[PDB]
Amino acid sequence: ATRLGEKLRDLRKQRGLTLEKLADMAGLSKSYLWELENRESQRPSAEKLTALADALGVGTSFFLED
């Protein structure tokens, strides 16, 4: 797995959101969000990082720091 993906999946599951729901919320495909959770990936774009962080109640810095 990966650090950004660990963080993203952990917070999503703690917020009670399915993969499909969080992807829909952030305007992402389900496969793209799965890739962020489970594969080495380019950092999400600033708008998508903002959407993901806001959906999960954390700062974008959560994903940008180690």
CA separation for the pair 14, 45 (Å, rounded)? 23
Question: Structural domain tally of the chain?
Answer: 1
What method was applied to determine this entry?
Answer: X-ray
CA separation for the pair 10, 16 (Å, rounded)? 10
* Amino acid, single-letter form, for residue 41: S
In terms of residue numbers, what domain contains 21? 1-66
**Resolution of the entry in angstroms:** 1.0
How many H-runs (helices) and E-runs (strands) does the chain carry? 5, 0
For residue 22, what are the CA distances in angstroms to 17, 41, 51, 54, 66? 6, 18, 10, 11, 23
Q: Show the tokens assigned to 13.
A: 């599951």
